[PDB]
Subunit: 206 residues, 2 copies
Amino acid sequence: AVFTVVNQCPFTVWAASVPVGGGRQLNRGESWRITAPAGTTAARIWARTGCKFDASGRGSCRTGDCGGVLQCTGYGRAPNTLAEYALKQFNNLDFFDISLIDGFNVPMSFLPDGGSGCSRGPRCAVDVNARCPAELRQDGVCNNACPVFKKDEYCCVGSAANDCHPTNYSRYFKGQCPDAYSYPKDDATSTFTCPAGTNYKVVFCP
Amino acid sequence: AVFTVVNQCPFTVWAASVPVGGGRQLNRGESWRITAPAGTTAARIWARTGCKFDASGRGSCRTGDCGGVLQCTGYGRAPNTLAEYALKQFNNLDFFDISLIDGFNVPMSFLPDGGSGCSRGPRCAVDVNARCPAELRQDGVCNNACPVFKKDEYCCVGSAANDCHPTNYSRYFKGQCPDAYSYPKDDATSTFTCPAGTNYKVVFCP
């Protein structure tokens, strides 16, 4: 699949992509095109904000920082809006979603971009930071309940998935961006699928 | 670079791309995204009209047929509008053009599509078939003088390159589409460069 990442935000972001791409600085209007193999799972695409790096690839970002490295080898730190995907799994379908479980930093859209008749994709284009619950505000953006409070009801990791539920905090994210995952077990309204062979578009600030 | 190829013609084209890509059936409104690695040289992308192929990808095409296969491994037969490129050769520049030396079958555009601040690209969006010279009319479209007349003055191969000049036939195509190669030594007006890292868009009937 080819992923075109366009930064339309009025500020430079540092896009990141695991396990393909790594990272790259994008100014306004710049685009990046990534080619992911079919069968790539546990993949993420997000924007890092406020960064500084040296020639040796080390530095830090205010949001989304993936361990100092510019070319990220691993996931980034909350708060960051996640475009996430798994290519060509059951019945050779691709699976994708926008996740807000690790917060929000920039608005995003993850839509099909040809290669098939797939059209429907997730959008979280509102500025979730604008009306963020005070408890959750962090680094100028909105973080979510599990990164901020670190407890079972919000996080649902491992055994806690067995009773994972909406909370007042998940409901904020869900009201702002219906399409995106607002808490761990939000599968029924956030799973999108396209035929394998589809290409995709991720836009920071749709 | 990634090449996005889209069929905007009201008829199906079987797009072709050598040496990376092969071939793909694109109905009206479809697009194919090819990833050509840096270091590619002597490559071209074109459309074949009127093709009939079976489940093994074996059959024939009216224009641009590459050896009876869908999956092109070799260059195709004239008449066919050619998008030609070479990635990252001298001083990390990409080289590209549209050539009508092997005739014209569909209208074409070959533009930068981000990855750098490159904006200029060639296009031959005019219906060259409408005012085509009678003698060059072949296979329902307009072919050019070297493949029709097989003569040194039009083909300019080897020692004939030294005397290569415009003819009444190359001037027809250059009038129609000033950006494209009308004859072999038309380099001064038909060469475009973009920094390595640029991605491109080839559109059939822009």
